Design a protein around this ligand. Structure first.
Ligand code: HEM
Ligand code: HEM
Ligand SMILES: Cc1cc(N)nc(CCc2cncc(C3CCN(C)CC3)c2)c1
Ligand SMILES: Cc1cc(N)nc(CCc2cncc(C3CCN(C)CC3)c2)c1
Ligand SMILES: C[C@H](O)[C@H](O)[C@H]1CNc2nc(N)[nH]c(=O)c2N1
Ligand SMILES: C[C@H](O)[C@H](O)[C@H]1CNc2nc(N)[nH]c(=O)c2N1
Ligand SMILES: [Zn+2]
Lengths: 411, 407
């Protein structure tokens, strides 16, 4: 079966066959599209076909499909599954698997980079202290004094679901949020709940606007433990504007390393519940969402006041004008400090070439338009005009419930 | 089966039950989402009529009444005898308003119940269509104080006598491919312009030539008519700060009027049903002016602003974009021509969505189309989960008549 996508700007038409290999469900039906919905213990029974599907893909990729090495490996995994109810991946398979989960991530505009991922195998880790050390090393490697390098650290896979490894932080580096008795918020309002957990767990909060949160780390299903990332490993960038000298006095900064730590990595049916991964920022993530969402730092008003825009009616587009200047400032600041960042024009242009390359060589590139299009200037980027097909391939990154809602406290 | 949508900015959760009444298919499956794809008999007819009449009679609190039953009775007999049926004026008006109410890609639906419906089912000739369209244009324009309207021509019979407006919109600018290899005017309209010329249009070969109407009545060959120039309200574009902006020579038309869609009501198909409201600024300033395949003016504007266009990361494109959109809104407002900015429009839509969930159990919405083409996440619709599904009455796409027409 063949599906066509068209780019309405260029009239380029692509043909997808890769979607034939999709296994997971989308959330949509013939009667309803859930394309804008944010969020729409395995028996041996279900496990071997998942292992087999993965190993077949791995051996095809190395041009050894149907080799004795392939057949022996299937054999070895089958016996390991029937004996132990699970199986261990070889380092090569783990690396291939992590790269492909990223390659398959339909919400990621950065995927041109997918084959360049440093994989840190942390499957020998046993304690929260061990997790802390692994994560410090990931932060140091990935940051690389501002010359950012993509990396993932993979902690032991799920067993019975009662011994999960989890990073309780949604991201490795994030700022605390504090709810004031008057209802105002200090810091990042998005992180108020997690900040409260940390305080409850014994974190001494400085109560400032940009306090780096401690790591809350869970090993082997035990209660999580608090650790402070060494401040010297946390690279930050003071935000200033190239023309507006008052912009520095807004007191803004941000961290250099975007590192998602709350997702689950599925490879060959195995589940890696703790798998922090990082790349580098696209400017709009900070300049549009982190700074300008009403529910985040929400600085649009203050900035517009300082530019002396007409703020009496929305039709002066004061919000849009200020948004642009803020995003110029983010990019300017990171570039000036030689910290890797990419603008939304470059990134979406690179994505289009990646997507086209994927169609030619892979038969498709699953992509979620709602996430791929940047949160400002959408139609002056080429992804806006690109039809996309969203489907789910494995290996994959998946959402999982927040650990505080599901954890059984040992005490 | 009962679906929740969440607003991630406000934490407000709405519960959708309205989707369970949807009939038409989405293009999506359990295995693939096609949310970003632009274009994904007596026995057929009577259940469609019944479903429609049931919802009509429910709407006026007369469900299960004798008048309900009598009407249902009358329609069924008419279908058995004549193979089709005729809508009562009340039903036609109800259906048209609900087609708009159901348009999942329309951000302006808070206005849905305030629609002026012109019944042109008595029309028989292309000259008649022209008169009805001129009257629509003049009524809807109202000297700049725009009023939403639809004009509805006779319904499809055997499919061989279709009424069609060949134009995709009532008011649009011609496009001409030059020897220079460049494109003059609106590049999106080169093909249709060629058809106009082939049909005898004497083209002015300018950059903002209002296309003539190509009107098809009763399945006959389309005829050419020029909308009276004094009925096409246009706005010269200037900027409140940049004096040089007027020198770009830009203008646009005040009346957004879609003429290529098919209105389905009660299984009946109205293949000619031009409708109009008023513009949201970004339609002109972002898409019409800044799409690379349209008037594509970003570079010229950025140069006049003397921006550093060496690096993408200067965001010169984004800066020029905002100023272009400031000029559009300022120009329409200064000339007192109705227009809405994307902040006001999306704020209105959130209020509408909440009304619809509260009073109807849902509101079908296509996020890909609802979120404005600039400044997406600083508008509230960006943070609003939406469910997209197809309800009738509806506006549907239909094939362009020049690939259909047996001349
Ligand atoms: C190397 C440069 C990268 C860039 C420029 C980039 C860009 C982005 C952006 C802008 C988003 C949307 C994030 C948001 O809106 O919250 C995203 C999401 C995502 N990225 Fe990438 N990314 C990069 C690297 C990576 C890497 C190394 C991985 C994994 C190995 C990855 C996997 C994902 C996944 C799974 C999502 C969806 C996250 C979610 O649903 O919350 N990305 N990326
Ligand atoms: C009165 C103010 C109105 C506003 C502000 C408004 C706004 C919009 C906008 C911005 C779009 C997207 C158009 C595009 O991107 O090409 C749209 C689409 C649409 N509108 Fe509305 N509209 C209004 C009136 C109406 C009326 C009166 C009707 C019908 C009676 C209508 C039915 C539709 C339909 C069917 C679409 C989708 C068209 C397509 O798929 O090409 N709108 N509207
Ligand atoms: C690997 C990767 C690369 C990249 N450019 N961005 C990301 C997301 C980064 C990120 C960092 N801190 C916090 C977040 C939050 C912001 C608020 N969003 C609603 C959820 C993600 C996201 C990940
Ligand atoms: C009723 C209505 C209201 C409104 N604000 N916009 C519309 C869309 C109007 C419209 C007018 N001229 C041209 C177009 C084209 C622009 C290019 N698009 C690809 C197709 C639609 C659309 C319709
Ligand atoms: C409701 C909607 O799905 C939600 O606001 C989405 C839209 N697109 C997004 N796109 C990105 N990259 N990141 C996001 O968090 C979101 N949020
Ligand atoms: C491919 C994609 O669906 C296409 O570019 C869409 C995106 N969203 C849109 N939204 C509106 N309102 N109008 C459009 O023409 C489009 N085009
Ligand atoms: Zn879908």
């Amino acid at each position: 079966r063949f599906l066509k996508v068209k780019n309405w700007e260029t009239d380029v038409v692509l043909t997808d066959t890769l979607h034939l290999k999709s296994t997971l469900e989308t959330g949509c039906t013939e009667h309803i599209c859930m394309g804008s919905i944010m969020l729409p213990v395995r028996t041996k029974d279900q496990l071997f076909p998942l292992a087999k599907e993965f190993l077949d893909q791995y051996y095809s990729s190395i041009k050894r499909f149907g080799s004795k090495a392939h057949m022996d490996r299937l054999e070895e995994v089958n016996k390991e599954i029937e004996s132990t109810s699970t199986y261990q991946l070889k380092d090569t398979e783990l690396i291939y698997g992590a790269k492909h989960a990223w390659r398959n991530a339909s919400r990621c505009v950065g995927r041109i980079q997918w084959s360049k991922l440093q994989v840190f195998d942390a499957r020998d880790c046993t304690t929260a202290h061990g997790m802390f050390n692994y994560i410090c090393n990931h932060v140091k490697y990935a940051t690389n004094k501002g010359n950012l390098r993509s990396a993932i650290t993979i902690f032991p896979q799920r067993t019975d679901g009662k011994h999960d490894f989890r990073v309780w932080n949604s991201q490795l580096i994030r700022y605390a949020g504090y709810k004031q008795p008057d209802g105002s918020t200090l810091g990042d309002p998005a992180n108020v709940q997690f900040t409260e957990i940390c305080i409850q767990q014994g974190w001494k909060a400085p109560r400032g606007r940009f306090d780096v949160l401690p790591l809350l780390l869970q090993a082997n299903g035990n209660d999580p433990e608090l650790f402070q990332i060494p401040p010297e490993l946390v690279l930050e960038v003071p935000i200033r504007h190239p023309k507006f000298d008052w912009f520095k006095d807004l007191g803004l900064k941000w961290y250099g390393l975007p590192a998602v730590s709350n997702m689950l990595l599925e490879i060959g049916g195995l589940e890696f519940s703790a798998c922090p991964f990082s790349g580098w920022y696209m400017g709009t993530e900070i300049g549009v969402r982190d700074y300008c969402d009403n529910s985040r730092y929400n600085i649009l008003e203050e900035v517009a006041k300082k530019m002396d825009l007409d703020m009496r009616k929305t039709s002066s587009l004061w919000k849009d004008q200020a948004l642009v200047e803020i995003n110029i400032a983010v990019l300017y600041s990171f570039q000036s400090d030689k910290v890797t960042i990419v603008d939304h024009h470059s990134a979406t242009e690179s994505f289009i070439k990646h997507m086209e390359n994927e169609y030619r060589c892979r038969g498709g590139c699953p992509a979620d338009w709602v996430w791929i299009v940047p949160p400002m200037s959408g139609s002056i980027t080429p992804v806006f005009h690109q039809e996309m097909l969203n489907y789910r391939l494995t290996p994959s990154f998946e959402y999982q419930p927040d650990p505080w809602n599901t954890h059984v406290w040992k005490g």
